[PDB]
């Protein structure tokens, strides 16, 4: 930077998609409860189909 000699970084650029200094509650994280419940009910479906 033109005016700050201590301001530098590496090539690594990125971001966390979080809310208010927290750990990111991702799109998969908010859909993973309903995917785990879909796997449990379709298990009951498959044993009902079989018998």
């Amino acid at each position: 930077r033109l005016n700050n000699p201590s301001r530098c970084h590496f090539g690594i650029v990125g971001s966390i998609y979080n809310l208010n200094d927290s750990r990111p509650f991702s799109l998969v994280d908010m859909m993973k409860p309903y995917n785990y419940l879909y796997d449990a009910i379709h298990d009951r479906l498959n044993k009902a189909i079989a018998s």
Binding site: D29, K32, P33, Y36, A40, D43, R44, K47
Partner: protein, 226 residues
């Protein structure tokens, strides 16, 4: 069963029968036979003693213990994997899988040639004498007493030495207590309804409890929070 099975000797049933002056020719010998007919006809699995023995199978055959009455499970000794049942018609027979067993007498017939198996079974509890030992449950004791009173009165009714109203009362009273005695031994305790609760309430259904010794059957099913 809610109450514990405290054991008493067979002559405790004879204090109760010989209170009746028409049952005064009863014996221990008659009390022995009518007890075993009663114990069998009720079929309560709480009256038997659970035993486990390891026997070795020589070639699709092994010798079964002497006290064995009913097998709970047979399993392999090295694996612990349980054996189901022999439906094969041509089992140890060659021409020119999932292991199994079959029991007829004092011989078990397995699907495995040379293996040791654990057999969890039920026997009868005996005394210092080699004689049956009965529960002290006054529901069991009352309906065993009414069993013997109904077998003795049935003989006496055939002889013409008992009124048909007397036998009809004994046949009725044994018929009530036999259901009360069945429900006394079958209906679970609070601690067995908890294992029944955990088996019944299962979001991911557990359908392979026979492979274990039904060990994890009443275990509680836990779901992670997400």
């Amino acid at each position: 069963m809610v109450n514990n099975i405290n054991w008493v000797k067979l002559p405790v049933i004879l204090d109760r029968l010989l209170r009746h002056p028409l049952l005064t020719d009863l014996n221990l010998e008659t009390a022995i036979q009518y007890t075993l007919d009663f114990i069998s006809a009720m079929g309560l699995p709480n009256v038997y003693v659970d035993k486990i023995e390891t026997i070795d199978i020589k070639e699709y055959r092994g010798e079964l213990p002497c006290d064995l009455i009913s097998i709970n499970q047979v399993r392999l000794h090295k694996n612990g994997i349980a054996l189901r049942a022999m439906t094969d018609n041509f089992n140890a027979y060659p021409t020119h899988g999932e292991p199994s067993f079959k029991t007829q007498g004092r011989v078990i017939f397995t699907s495995i040639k040379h293996e040791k198996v654990d057999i969890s079974y039920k026997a009868i509890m005996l005394d210092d004498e080699g004689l049956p030992l009965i529960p002290d449950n006054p529901i069991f004791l009352k309906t065993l007493e009414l069993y013997i009173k109904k077998e003795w009165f049935t003989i006496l009714f055939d002889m013409g030495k008992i009124s048909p109203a007397v036998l009809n009362n004994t046949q009725q009273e044994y018929a009530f207590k036999a259901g009360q005695c069945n429900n006394e031994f079958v209906i679970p305790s609070v601690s067995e309804m908890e294992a029944i609760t955990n088996m019944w309430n299962q979001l991911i259904p557990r359908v392979t409890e026979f492979r274990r010794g039904f060990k994890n059957l009443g275990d509680k099913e836990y779901i992670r929070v997400h």
